[PDB]
Write a protein that binds this ligand. Sequence first.
Ligand SMILES: O=C(O)COc1ccc(Cl)cc1Cl
Ligand code: NA
Length: 428
Amino acid sequence: FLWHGGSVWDAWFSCASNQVAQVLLTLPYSFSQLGMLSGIVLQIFYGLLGSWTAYLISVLYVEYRARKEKEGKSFKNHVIQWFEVLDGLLGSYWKALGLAFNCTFLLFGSVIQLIACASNIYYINDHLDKRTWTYIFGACCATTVFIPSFHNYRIWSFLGLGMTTYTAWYLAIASIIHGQAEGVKHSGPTKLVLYFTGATNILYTFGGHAVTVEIMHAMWKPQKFKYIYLMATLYVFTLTIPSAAAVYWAFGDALLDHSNAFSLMPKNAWRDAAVILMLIHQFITFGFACTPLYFVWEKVIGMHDTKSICLRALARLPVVIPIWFLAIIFPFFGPINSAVGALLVSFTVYIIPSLAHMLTYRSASARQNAAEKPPFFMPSWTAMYVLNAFVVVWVLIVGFGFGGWASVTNFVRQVDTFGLFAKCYQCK
Ligand SMILES: O=C(O)COc1ccc(Cl)cc1Cl
Ligand code: NA
């Protein structure tokens, strides 16, 4: 009860901002690297852990606002940010950590959208290789230095949800109708590097929810908290499990060579519709990631105020040129999710939110005068502390130690094979 979350519409507007658009096409690859038994258990595991960490971020936001409003403060005409909460609760070293990590991740999450945009357009008009489509789409994305901000974020998310729901159910039904071939093989785990570069792509997937609660996070007065609101957290499962299971079931071990699943499906108007919807979706996730970087760069350089559109744009172009060169040089759609999710997501989404919560409520004085008692599904404090320590140690060893070695070895293998400035990655 009294969950500071809102009504049914705001509650579903939080599951809408659970971006799983682009990574949806690289999950059969991970299944072919792991097998059927490990692919499902790990998806459920990481989905539950992601929901837990999102809850942690929420309770920390509420704790900070509640502490600040008591000593005398007005939060009117001023939205709170993540690094501000970290600075207010822990100190300045945490304000530096939660800024460096959240800026590096936002830099590397747009290279991926540019790569995917240049990759999916190849399965409509394959007269120009993927590097020329990267030239063209980078020149198109370098025009976001003219769009100031977004006037509305509700409609974009509510349309992205449907654009994802069409593709996640085309990929399953087309694969079922196509059936199995004659002499396809489902070999499970063979090498270690492959198992652990698949597990990290699965870790990456379920950290997109908590990453938005670290940037926008709108909150308001509490409501009565109908308990049906929880049934919107487990709606990404009907998007990710059937589509990834039914493509691997049909196409076997031909997927450890094709990271984009559109390359195996038979061409039809439905496939063309899904490519276009995915392009429209991945063109929105690029601006929603490049806007905070623009804001932070303008604040840092000391030029927040600008009246002409020609001055803002011109000053705002050391931030989109490395996002372009990095997409041109390393165009590895699918092997890059593992590296990014092993080096940045494991710290941004999992270890830091659970370490801040452990370090905040250390003393009994901080635990008796708390803004929110422990939830109904976790009564004691020892339960929360044990769960946090487990999350920290697990993501530290399996997510960073093994995942890191495996994913970086795979990323270097791709460069050894295809070279730098590759012309067409995984084209016949
Ligand atoms: O389209 C994508 O890139 C997949 O969505 C995500 C998945 C994981 C994380 Cl951390 C962030 C995002 Cl935006
Ligand atoms: Na991967």
